């Protein structure tokens, strides 16, 4: 379109991102720090960030990768069945760890096998004002992959919300109308993040006319009817919904394989992609709340005091971008993005 019209808003933040580690960190930190004031750095490195010491060391590597001078990373811990209440208390005391992430687990991955095992941890989190971030999916063999989110809401999340009414809980990267309704009907202590990719795409983009693993992510892209509920939620501006990309890069070779890794890469153009959704819905006025106000307000952190400018201008995205010594295929590779943000 290239109308070259402008919108100035408060500088945004990203409340859910995977930066990985090591050689790729200069590339991922470059992308995330371009315009964000802050980002919430997810803990599922190898090994996972299960302690305060690990979180602070990882934070130092991020800062060493040379972010923009306006950028502050915020860290999260990875919860396990062995996590003690004491580690929660130490982490919050550091001032740089603001949340802990619950990844469900069954040879099965590390994580929490039973919510009951971490009740003392959740109590400690409630007490210190640490947020619980939840990847809301069960891992039961009997449950179909597209039903895992809905099953989680009923069996796991509802009991937790019922038991911890003063615990701030973010349902990360919601993908279903079931989760939208859950969050809307839960109390003031429940909120959710919405990715750019679950707003722009549905499962047909991954599977029609060929299989496209660069659209493969967890939780999985759902039906178009679920996508439409997410768009309505995000563009309402409601205080319960805020920006969290779940940008999750892997090397091209690990994506395009007999068994390809889960994760879509949107950090190269995240706010620009969100702007297209909000513009298409005729709701650009609500973008600032979603991107810059709702998350900090829910986390209890100050809003950014600087502004960014969104310009309606199309630009082509490269087929691939550097990713350490390898490459990553970004969302909209070989196509145009319709806004620029600086």
Query: Would you please indicate which residues are annotated as catalytic (active-site) residues?
Result: 246
Q: Of 187 and 282, which CB lies nearer to Cl ion in the complex structure?
A: 282
Binding mask 96-125 for Cl ion (x = CB under 5 A): ------------------------------
Q: CA–CA separation, 241 vs 239, rounded Å?
A: 6
Q: Which does 280 bind (CB under 5 to 8 A by kind): a copy of itself, Zn ion, Cl ion, none?
A: none
- Burial class of residue 92, CB neighbours in 10 A (0-12, 13-18, 19+): buried
Does 77 carry a binding-site annotation? no
Choose the stretch contacting a copy of itself; rule: CB under 8 A; options: 6-14, 167-175, 234-242, 253-261: 253-261
Q: CA–CA separation, 52 vs 87, rounded Å?
A: 7
- Provide the edge-to-edge strand list for the sheet that holds 38-41: 14-17, 38-41, 72-78, 97-102, 131-134, 169-171, 190-194, 241-243
Shortest distance in whole angstroms from residue 21 CB to Cl ion: 39
Q: Of 56 and 284, which CB lies nearer to Cl ion in the complex structure?
A: 284
SS3 of 56, please? helix
SS3 of 184, please? helix
Is 318 a binding residue for a copy of itself by CB under 8 A? The answer is no
Q: Which does 284 bind (CB under 5 to 8 A by kind): Cl ion, a copy of itself, Zn ion, none?
A: Cl ion
For a copy of itself, which residue of 329, 331, 337, 341 counts as binding (CB under 8 A)? 329
Look at residues 196, 198, 197, 216 and name the one whose alpha carbon lies nearest to residue 206.
216
Is 284 a binding residue for Cl ion by CB under 5 A? The answer is yes
**C-beta neighbour count of 14 within 10 angstroms:** 26
Q: What is the DSSP letter of 213?
A: G
Is 204 a binding residue for a copy of itself by CB under 8 A? The answer is yes
**C-beta neighbour count of 281 within 10 angstroms:** 15
Residues near Zn ion (CB under 5 A) are 42, 135, 246
For a copy of itself, which residue of 95, 144, 162, 302 counts as binding (CB under 8 A)? 144
Judge contact between 136 and 171, C-beta under 8 A.
Answer: yes
Q: Looking at residues 237 to 266 of the shown chain, list those that interact with Cl ion (rule: CB under 5 A).
A: none
Does 246 carry a binding-site annotation? yes
Does 222 carry a binding-site annotation? no
Is 262 a binding residue for a copy of itself by CB under 8 A? The answer is yes
| 133, β-bridge pairs | 101, 170
Look at residues 240, 183, 180, 246 and name the one whose alpha carbon lies nearest to residue 219.
246
Does 228 carry a binding-site annotation? no
Judge contact between 341 and 271, C-beta under 8 A.
Answer: yes
For a copy of itself, which residue of 220, 232, 284, 327 counts as binding (CB under 8 A)? 220
If you search the block for the tokens 């911890």, which residue do you land on? Answer: 164
Q: Which does 258 bind (CB under 5 to 8 A by kind): Cl ion, Zn ion, a copy of itself, none?
A: a copy of itself
Is 281 a binding residue for Cl ion by CB under 5 A? The answer is no
Q: Which residues bind Cl ion (CB under 5 A)?
A: 282, 284
Q: Which residues bind a copy of itself (CB under 8 A)?
A: 142, 144-146, 202-204, 207-214, 216, 220, 223-224, 256-262, 329, 333
- Binding-site annotation, residues for substrate: 18-20, 44, 135, 218, 250, 262
């Amino acid at each position: 379109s290239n109308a070259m019209t402008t919108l100035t808003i408060t500088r945004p933040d990203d409340w859910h991102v995977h930066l990985r580690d090591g050689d790729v960190l200069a590339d991922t930190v470059r992308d995330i720090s371009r315009y964000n004031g802050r980002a919430l750095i997810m803990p599922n490195t190898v090994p996972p960030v299960t302690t305060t010491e690990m979180a602070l060391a990882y934070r130092e590597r991020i800062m060493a990768a040379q972010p923009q001078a306006h950028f502050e990373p915020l860290m999260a811990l990875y919860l396990t069945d062995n996590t003690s209440p004491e580690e929660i208390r130490k982490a919050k005391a550091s001032g740089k760890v603001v949340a802990a992430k619950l990844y469900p687990a069954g040879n099965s991955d590390s994580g929490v096998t039973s919510a009951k095992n971490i009740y003392p941890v959740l109590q400690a989190m409630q007490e210190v004002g640490m947020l619980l971030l939840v990847h809301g999916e069960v891992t039961t063999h009997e449950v179909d992959i597209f039903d895992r989110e809905k099953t989680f809401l009923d069996t796991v999340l509802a009991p937790i919300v019922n038991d911890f009414p003063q615990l701030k809980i973010v349902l990360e990267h919601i993908t279903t109308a079931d989760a939208v309704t859950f969050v809307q009907q839960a109390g003031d202590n429940v909120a959710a993040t919405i990715t750019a990719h679950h707003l722009l795409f549905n499962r047909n983009h991954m599977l029609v006319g060929g299989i496209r693993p660069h659209f493969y992510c967890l939780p999985i892209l759902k039906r178009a009817t679920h996508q439409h509920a997410l768009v309505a939620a995000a563009t309402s501006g409601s205080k319960k919904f805020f920006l969290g990309t779940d940008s999750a890069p892997h090397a091209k070779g690990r994506k395009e394989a007999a068994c390809g890794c889960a994760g879509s890469y949107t950090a190269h153009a995240a706010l620009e992609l969100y702007a297209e959704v909000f513009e298409k819905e005729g709701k650009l006025e609500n973008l600032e709340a979603f991107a810059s106000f709702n998350g900090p307000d829910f986390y209890g952190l100050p809003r950014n005091q600087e502004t960014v400018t969104l310009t309606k201008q199309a630009w082509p995205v490269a087929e691939s971008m550097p990713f350490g010594s390898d490459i990553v295929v970004p969302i909209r590779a070989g196509e145009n993005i319709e806004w620029t943000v600086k």
